[PDB]
Design an enzyme around this catalytic site. Structure first.
Site, PDB file in Angstrom:
ATOM      1  N   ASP A   1      -0.357  -6.981  10.862  1.00  0.00           N
ATOM      2  CA  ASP A   1       0.840  -6.231  11.055  1.00  0.00           C
ATOM      3  C   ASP A   1       1.954  -6.998  10.822  1.00  0.00           C
ATOM      4  OD1 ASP A   1       2.786  -4.436  12.368  1.00  0.00           O
ATOM      5  OD2 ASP A   1       0.953  -3.377  12.786  1.00  0.00           O
TER       6      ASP A   1
ATOM      7  N   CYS B   1      13.990  -3.579  -0.141  1.00  0.00           N
ATOM      8  CA  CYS B   1      14.189  -2.352  -0.385  1.00  0.00           C
ATOM      9  C   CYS B   1      14.897  -1.570   0.708  1.00  0.00           C
ATOM     10  CB  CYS B   1      13.140  -1.447  -1.249  1.00  0.00           C
ATOM     11  SG  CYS B   1      13.469   0.246  -1.372  1.00  0.00           S
TER      12      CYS B   1
ATOM     13  N   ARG C   1       6.488   5.757   5.569  1.00  0.00           N
ATOM     14  CA  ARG C   1       6.012   6.896   4.994  1.00  0.00           C
ATOM     15  C   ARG C   1       6.410   8.190   5.330  1.00  0.00           C
ATOM     16  NH1 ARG C   1       1.459   5.478   2.108  1.00  0.00           N
ATOM     17  NH2 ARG C   1       0.626   3.446   2.537  1.00  0.00           N
TER      18      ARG C   1
ATOM     19  N   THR D   1       0.898  -1.340   0.003  1.00  0.00           N
ATOM     20  CA  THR D   1      -0.036  -0.063  -0.113  1.00  0.00           C
ATOM     21  C   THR D   1       0.844   1.348  -0.033  1.00  0.00           C
ATOM     22  OG1 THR D   1      -0.090  -0.099   2.236  1.00  0.00           O
ATOM     23  CG2 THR D   1      -2.057  -1.150   1.312  1.00  0.00           C
TER      24      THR D   1
ATOM     25  N   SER E   1      -8.287  -0.430   3.193  1.00  0.00           N
ATOM     26  CA  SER E   1      -8.591   0.851   2.406  1.00  0.00           C
ATOM     27  C   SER E   1      -7.423   1.564   1.522  1.00  0.00           C
ATOM     28  CB  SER E   1      -9.165   1.956   3.481  1.00  0.00           C
ATOM     29  OG  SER E   1     -10.008   1.443   4.393  1.00  0.00           O
TER      30      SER E   1
ATOM     31  N   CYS F   1      13.985  -8.564 -10.793  1.00  0.00           N
ATOM     32  CA  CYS F   1      14.989  -9.511  -9.701  1.00  0.00           C
ATOM     33  C   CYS F   1      14.408 -10.960  -9.589  1.00  0.00           C
ATOM     34  CB  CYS F   1      15.120  -8.861  -8.696  1.00  0.00           C
ATOM     35  SG  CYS F   1      16.050  -7.371  -8.607  1.00  0.00           S
TER      36      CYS F   1
ATOM     37  N   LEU G   1       8.643  -2.106   2.834  1.00  0.00           N
ATOM     38  CA  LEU G   1       8.164  -1.590   4.003  1.00  0.00           C
ATOM     39  C   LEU G   1       9.109  -0.519   4.247  1.00  0.00           C
ATOM     40  CD1 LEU G   1       8.595  -4.752   6.608  1.00  0.00           C
ATOM     41  CD2 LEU G   1       6.444  -3.432   5.719  1.00  0.00           C
ATOM     42  N   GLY G   2       8.522   0.455   5.077  1.00  0.00           N
ATOM     43  CA  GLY G   2       8.785   2.119   4.924  1.00  0.00           C
ATOM     44  C   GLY G   2       7.972   2.527   6.115  1.00  0.00           C
TER      45      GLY G   2
ATOM     46  N   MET H   1      10.985  -1.845  10.657  1.00  0.00           N
ATOM     47  CA  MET H   1      11.431  -2.501   9.204  1.00  0.00           C
ATOM     48  C   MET H   1      12.395  -3.595   9.794  1.00  0.00           C
ATOM     49  SD  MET H   1      12.181   0.845   6.753  1.00  0.00           S
ATOM     50  CE  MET H   1      13.011   1.666   8.098  1.00  0.00           C
TER      51      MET H   1
HETATM   52  N1  LIG Z   1      11.380   8.292  -0.322  1.00  0.00           N
HETATM   53  C1  LIG Z   1      12.668   8.085  -0.505  1.00  0.00           C
HETATM   54  O1  LIG Z   1      13.004   9.211  -1.223  1.00  0.00           O
HETATM   55  C2  LIG Z   1      13.392   7.063  -0.317  1.00  0.00           C
HETATM   56  C3  LIG Z   1      14.819   6.805  -0.869  1.00  0.00           C
HETATM   57  C4  LIG Z   1      15.432   5.819  -0.542  1.00  0.00           C
HETATM   58  C5  LIG Z   1      14.885   4.609   0.139  1.00  0.00           C
HETATM   59  N2  LIG Z   1      13.479   4.756   0.448  1.00  0.00           N
HETATM   60  C6  LIG Z   1      13.106   3.634   1.051  1.00  0.00           C
HETATM   61  O2  LIG Z   1      12.409   2.728   0.385  1.00  0.00           O
HETATM   62  C7  LIG Z   1      11.218   2.053   0.867  1.00  0.00           C
HETATM   63  C8  LIG Z   1      10.019   2.021   0.506  1.00  0.00           C
HETATM   64  O3  LIG Z   1       9.798   3.655   0.197  1.00  0.00           O
HETATM   65  P1  LIG Z   1       8.257   3.898   0.058  1.00  0.00           P
HETATM   66  O4  LIG Z   1       7.983   5.322   0.003  1.00  0.00           O
HETATM   67  O5  LIG Z   1       7.683   3.276  -1.373  1.00  0.00           O
HETATM   68  O6  LIG Z   1       7.463   3.133   1.045  1.00  0.00           O
HETATM   69  P2  LIG Z   1       6.303   3.906   2.003  1.00  0.00           P
HETATM   70  O7  LIG Z   1       5.487   4.999   0.948  1.00  0.00           O
HETATM   71  O8  LIG Z   1       6.700   4.630   3.076  1.00  0.00           O
HETATM   72  O9  LIG Z   1       5.136   2.812   2.193  1.00  0.00           O
HETATM   73  C9  LIG Z   1       5.444   2.102   3.454  1.00  0.00           C
HETATM   74  C10 LIG Z   1       4.783   0.806   3.503  1.00  0.00           C
HETATM   75  O10 LIG Z   1       5.221   0.145   4.481  1.00  0.00           O
HETATM   76  C11 LIG Z   1       4.033  -0.424   5.158  1.00  0.00           C
HETATM   77  N3  LIG Z   1       3.860  -0.556   6.724  1.00  0.00           N
HETATM   78  C12 LIG Z   1       4.642   0.125   7.609  1.00  0.00           C
HETATM   79  N4  LIG Z   1       4.503  -0.327   8.792  1.00  0.00           N
HETATM   80  C13 LIG Z   1       3.880  -1.589   8.682  1.00  0.00           C
HETATM   81  C14 LIG Z   1       3.580  -2.536   9.738  1.00  0.00           C
HETATM   82  N5  LIG Z   1       3.957  -2.580  10.807  1.00  0.00           N
HETATM   83  N6  LIG Z   1       2.890  -3.696   9.259  1.00  0.00           N
HETATM   84  C15 LIG Z   1       2.772  -3.838   7.780  1.00  0.00           C
HETATM   85  N7  LIG Z   1       3.183  -2.739   6.942  1.00  0.00           N
HETATM   86  C16 LIG Z   1       3.503  -1.796   7.516  1.00  0.00           C
HETATM   87  C17 LIG Z   1       2.758   0.731   5.056  1.00  0.00           C
HETATM   88  O11 LIG Z   1       1.724   0.098   5.025  1.00  0.00           O
HETATM   89  P3  LIG Z   1       0.487   1.107   5.609  1.00  0.00           P
HETATM   90  O12 LIG Z   1      -0.170   1.776   4.432  1.00  0.00           O
HETATM   91  O13 LIG Z   1      -0.538   0.496   6.465  1.00  0.00           O
HETATM   92  O14 LIG Z   1       1.040   2.473   6.154  1.00  0.00           O
HETATM   93  C18 LIG Z   1       3.271   0.997   3.583  1.00  0.00           C
HETATM   94  O15 LIG Z   1       2.813  -0.045   2.658  1.00  0.00           O
HETATM   95  C19 LIG Z   1      11.271   2.513   2.510  1.00  0.00           C
HETATM   96  O16 LIG Z   1      12.022   1.606   3.608  1.00  0.00           O
HETATM   97  C20 LIG Z   1      12.196   3.753   2.169  1.00  0.00           C
HETATM   98  O17 LIG Z   1      12.652   4.248   3.737  1.00  0.00           O
HETATM   99  C21 LIG Z   1      12.928   5.801   0.168  1.00  0.00           C
END
Ligand SMILES: NC(=O)c1ccc[n+]([C@@H]2O[C@H](COP(=O)([O-])OP(=O)(O)OC[C@H]3O[C@@H](n4cnc5c(N)ncnc54)[C@H](OP(=O)(O)O)[C@@H]3O)[C@@H](O)[C@H]2O)c1
Length: 204
Positions: A53, A108, A77, A11, A37, A187, A74-75, A86
């Site tokens: 979770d 990731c 947000r 999501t 949702s 991959c 995972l991340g 994570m």
């Molecule tokens: N944004 C950047 O510029 C950037 C750059 C380098 C690396 N990254 C890394 O790349 C990864 C992905 O980035 P992203 O923006 O695509 O991810 P994201 O938009 O933050 O979405 C995070 C996902 O993790 C899920 N999650 C969090 N806690 C959870 C839990 N306790 N149980 C189950 N699911 C959970 C969230 O579910 P929910 O919808 O319920 O919250 C969501 O589906 C992250 O680790 C981020 O740190 C990001």
């Protein structure tokens, strides 16, 4: 080949487009979600949904059950607070994969794992610290682990023309979320990335 896959973080920013792409590729996709949702209600949709979770090992165990491979996106947000979600989630995923004979995990973290650690922006150190903890979990697991370490994730359209750099920093500091998801699925089709770090990047 790989037919059935689990996605964690489906999501999220990159998960939503990885989920869509994987469903259109022909994969049988299982997702663990905290709130359905935030999954699409029409269009490319997963074949199985587990509500739960990633911190609850029982929820992770029924997501990984019966799979051929696992994608981790995972991340946190917009939360930059200290966290272990994570890495703890990753300990749950590794154990369920071993309990169900799954080998392939594509996960990731971030390009900052290839940076001089003093050079990470202070606002991003807390999240980065848990990427490091998660990378250690998967590295130590002994599974077939592709470490995806992207730079900035943008919202540019899908191109499929991005670069992939192995075990080092790439020549661009951005990957679109759509190309990042595209590559997570690439991959699944090869073993050439197993046990390497991969940096996907492109110029938009
Ligand atoms: N944004 C950047 O510029 C950037 C750059 C380098 C690396 N990254 C890394 O790349 C990864 C992905 O980035 P992203 O923006 O695509 O991810 P994201 O938009 O933050 O979405 C995070 C996902 O993790 C899920 N999650 C969090 N806690 C959870 C839990 N306790 N149980 C189950 N699911 C959970 C969230 O579910 P929910 O919808 O319920 O919250 C969501 O589906 C992250 O680790 C981020 O740190 C990001």
């Amino acid at each position: 080949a790989v037919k059935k896959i689990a996605i964690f973080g489906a999501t999220g920013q990159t998960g939503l487009t990885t989920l869509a792409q994987a469903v259109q590729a022909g994969y049988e996709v299982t997702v663990l979600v905290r709130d359905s949702s935030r999954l699409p209600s029409e269009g490319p949709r997963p074949a199985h949904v587990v509500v739960g979770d990633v911190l609850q090992a029982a929820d992770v165990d029924k997501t990984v059950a019966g799979q051929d491979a696992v994608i981790v996106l995972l991340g946190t947000r917009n939360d930059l607070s200290p966290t272990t979600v994570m890495s703890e989630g990753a300990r749950n995923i590794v154990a369920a994969m071993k309990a169900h004979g799954v080998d392939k995990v594509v996960a990731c973290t971030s390009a900052f794992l290839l940076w001089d650690p003093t050079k990470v922006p202070p606002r991003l150190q807390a999240v980065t610290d848990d990427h490091i903890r998660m990378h250690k979990v998967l590295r130590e697991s002994g599974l077939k682990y592709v470490a995806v370490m992207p730079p900035h994730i943008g919202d540019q359209p899908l191109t499929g023309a991005y670069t992939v750099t192995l075990d080092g920093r790439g020549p661009s500091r951005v990957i679109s979320k759509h190309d990042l998801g595209h590559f997570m699925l690439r991959c699944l089709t090869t073993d050439e990335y197993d046990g390497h770090s991969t940096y996907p990047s492109h110029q938009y």
